[PDB]
Amino acid sequence: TMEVDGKVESIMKRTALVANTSNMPVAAREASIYTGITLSEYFRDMGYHVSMMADSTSRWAEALREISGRLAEMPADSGYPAYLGARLASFYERAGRVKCLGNPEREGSVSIVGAVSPPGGDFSDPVTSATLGIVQVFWGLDKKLAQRKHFPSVNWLISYSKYMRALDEYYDKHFTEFVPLRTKAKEILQEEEDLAEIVQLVGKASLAETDKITLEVAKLIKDDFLQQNGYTPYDRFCPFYKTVGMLSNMISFYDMARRAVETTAQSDNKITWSIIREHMGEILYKLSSMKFKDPVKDGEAKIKADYAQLLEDMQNAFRSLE
């Protein structure tokens, strides 16, 4: 169900399912993607935005290979037909935001979220290789994160999105501060990915204070920003103003801790992550609890005000320490 105009409505009022199992005719499985994308194109033509989710393009590709074998066509790379790549390209190409046909000026779009199934994580098989060469985003779910209870299970290292440049025009207008914030968050995650190897060889304490800040802020982000308890009301849906405010507060903490450590590493009263943790435990707890603000009980204005307050209190604590 979904909330539209304050009322709970079933999503089947806006969803259409092209559903078929493995014993359904092979021509149906191969034509499933095309029927779905043609329905999505039809609804796009009316100026709607249509999310088309193909659950297994790998199984569509296996249906394609089966039809090719029944036609007795020459087998190409790893058994798939001579035209698997061309077909995937001409299919994914049908996505995109369009100025719709016809007189009433309209804009629609079809967004294809086509999932792919690599055998045991092997991205090399033709379907996965062409899919990852033809798509522009890859969300890279991960069973290991699922077991670690990191929900969503997005791996945030193999994942990527090539639309970041196209969205500068939008972020610089509506969420002006988000782009550098995102860059710094990605850098922090990469830095922890690097430090995890060092910590194996020489242990955690060997790290500089800057690297301790990196490790602990990255822990904060992973546990209380990327991880998300979707089953609970407060953050099942995270409005982007809330997301950008969360990341702003966390990266402000990063900048302030980095400044405090860097400007006092040369002094007698050298500040350390231990001192920061002991002094600003309250601020760390509030940052970790930032998840709990509920847009349905706290208004957008209240959430923004509370995050600004957290920023101010963090500023005051860092200023009193420095």
């Binding site: 020489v202 242990g203 304490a205 060997s206």
Partner: protein, 110 residues
């Protein structure tokens, strides 16, 4: 057959270890120890250290920290385990943990 103990250090320290029971005059009438008198210079001190290091029966070698520092360029060359060198304090100069020949191998000791 069994291993000995060898000492380099002040007259006082050598007297202490000898009373402990380390000293012996070998078949050549060469002691397994040396007192570092002011007449003994760096070259002879390191000659004796090298002698202890080569001779197979010496075993465990004791050296005070300052004398080890004066001997350092041989302690860096010493790279086999059994002739165990121990850098030890003294009333002459204290011991410190930093820059010990064996502790060179430790990188996690902050």
């Amino acid at each position: 057959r069994g291993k000995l103990i060898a000492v380099i250090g002040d007259e006082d320290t050598v007297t202490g270890f000898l009373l402990g029971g380390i000293g012996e005059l070998n078949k050549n009438r060469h002691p397994n120890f040396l007192v570092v008198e002011k007449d003994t210079t760096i070259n002879e001190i390191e000659d004796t250290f090298r002698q202890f290091l080569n001779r197979d029966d010496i075993g465990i070698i004791l050296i005070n920290q300052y004398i080890a520092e004066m001997v350092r360029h041989a302690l860096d060359a010493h790279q086999r385990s059994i002739p165990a060198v121990l850098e030890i304090p003294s009333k002459e100069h204290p011991y410190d943990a930093a820059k010990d020949s064996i502790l060179r191998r430790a990188k996690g000791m902050f």
